[PDB]
Amino acid sequence: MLYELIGLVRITNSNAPKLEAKELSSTIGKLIIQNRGVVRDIVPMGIRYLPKIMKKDQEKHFRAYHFLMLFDSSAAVQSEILRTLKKDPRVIRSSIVKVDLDKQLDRASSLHRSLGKKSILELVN
């Protein structure tokens, strides 16, 4: 199954805000690939202000580093990834949505599919 994760990583280190998101992506990608998975995209969204002052665990956030990860993995490991995301202080919000592959093996992320690039092959041409 193809899945699209959209994480909202915290940025406490002001001088290098991307520092957290990089190691988040590294951890999740390592898990996926070591569990017979594949990572198709790690599309970075930017630093953005959250709509509200969201309180993950016992610390309040007003902004976060948004990032998207498109990855092919099985249901069990996808649940495991969601579990690790939900119990990580670094992550404020997380969400994994399926991308249906009944038509096409190759499919771009939601952002590129919205821009018009239906599959990764268009995105690389």
């Binding site: 017979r36 998975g37 594949v38 092919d72 093996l105």
Partner: protein, 56 residues
């Protein structure tokens, strides 16, 4: 009953691919793509492994 068990076991075999693919055909097809590209190695192994993981 033998039939149900054999069918389920054949489903559970390794290198079994979904969406009507066969591993023998897939390997031969990938080799044919590479030979045709020549006629007109670890990176190709990674491409093969990615394909087999997606189609597993």
């Amino acid at each position: 009953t033998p039939f149900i068990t054999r069918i389920m076991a054949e489903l559970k075999e390794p290198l079994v691919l979904s969406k009507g693919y066969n591993i023998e055909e897939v390997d031969k097809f990938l080799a044919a793509i590479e030979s045709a590209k020549r006629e007109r190695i670890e990176k190709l192994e990674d491409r093969r492994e990615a394909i087999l993981r997606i189609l597993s």
